[PDB]
Structure formats: C-alpha cells, structure tokens
Design a protein around this nucleic acid. Sequence first.
RNA 1: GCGGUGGAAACUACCAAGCUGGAGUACGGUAGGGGCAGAGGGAAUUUCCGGUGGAGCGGUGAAAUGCGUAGAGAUCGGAAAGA
Length: 118
Amino acid sequence: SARKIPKGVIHVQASFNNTIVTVTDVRGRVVSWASAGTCGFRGTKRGTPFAAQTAAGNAIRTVVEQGMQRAEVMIKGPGLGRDAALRAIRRSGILLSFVRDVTPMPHNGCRPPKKRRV
RNA sequence: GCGGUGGAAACUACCAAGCUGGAGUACGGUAGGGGCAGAGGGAAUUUCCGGUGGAGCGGUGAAAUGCGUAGAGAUCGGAAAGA
C-alpha cells in the first residue's frame, strides 16, 4: 500500500523517442511508474502517441487501489508523447487540477553535442 | 644641355608679420557588451549521499555496443564541481 491520500503528482518524461508515465505522492515516493518500454512493445515503436496512450493507461489503471481524485500532472521535455498522454489522463477523467511543465530550460550551461549531418 | 650676365615676381621655396575654417587644448554635457582587475549571482548538466520503486533505461533510417536485480532510468531532498 501507501500513505492512502488521493491527491498526488504525475510526471510524464516525454522523451524524443520515449515516454515515461510515473506517479508519485507529495513527498516523492513513487506509487507506480509505467513507460513505453514497460507496456510491451519496444524499439522504433515506443515513443509514439499510441505508446503514450497505452503507457499512461497502464500507468494510472493500477492506482485504482487508491482511486485518486485530485490529480495534477507535471510533464517534461519534447516529443510526440505529450498530447496523447493528456488525452489519456482526461480520458480517465479524474480531478486533474492543473498540468504544468517542469522542463529544464538551461541558461547556456553545457555545450550540446555535434550536429548530426544526417 | 651646361655656364656667365642683365631683367620679371604670378606659382613652388625662402624672410618676416598677422589670420582662422584645418588641427588641437581648456570647459560643460553625453552614449557605450571599450579594456583590465575585484566581488557577487542563478538556471542547467554531471557526479556523489540519502528516501521510494522494481526491469528496463538510453540510442537509431532500423538496430546494436553501453548501462541495469550489485536496483538503472524516473522522482524529492542534500552537497560539491567546473564551464
């Protein structure tokens, strides 16, 4: 089990080739995580909006032991996995308070690597 | 062409004396990522230290090497580091 409080943050690591749908409490002990590599298929298929939908659905379908009402989602990063994930959470329709972005916006910190030339 | 000699004085040069628009300086402002030195800053990244949780994470045209049950990645806190 857990603390049994039905409010908790959801983080969506939407990568450029993957998604991770994790869900955790206010302190930060994770109650479940499920990614595109978690839900079966793996390779070039993972990181597509069907993987965001299935990974989000298989992520938050297992919080029915909690039955969280007051949801709040804190996504991160670029990729094709955001909008399908928000349509998945709104499909489950639980009390999504506010979604938000927490993406790392650097202030010219490190040099990003070589351009691809492909 | 060179030399001697007699004349001219506009121009270059010369002698002397003024002139100011050229150029500077004095003064008052004024704008500036001009330079150098000293302090201070916060994102981000990486690594380490803790709590969670458990199988992938990462990557690609598609894969693979890598890393991961010695608990990775993700998440929250704690430091430190250089750029």
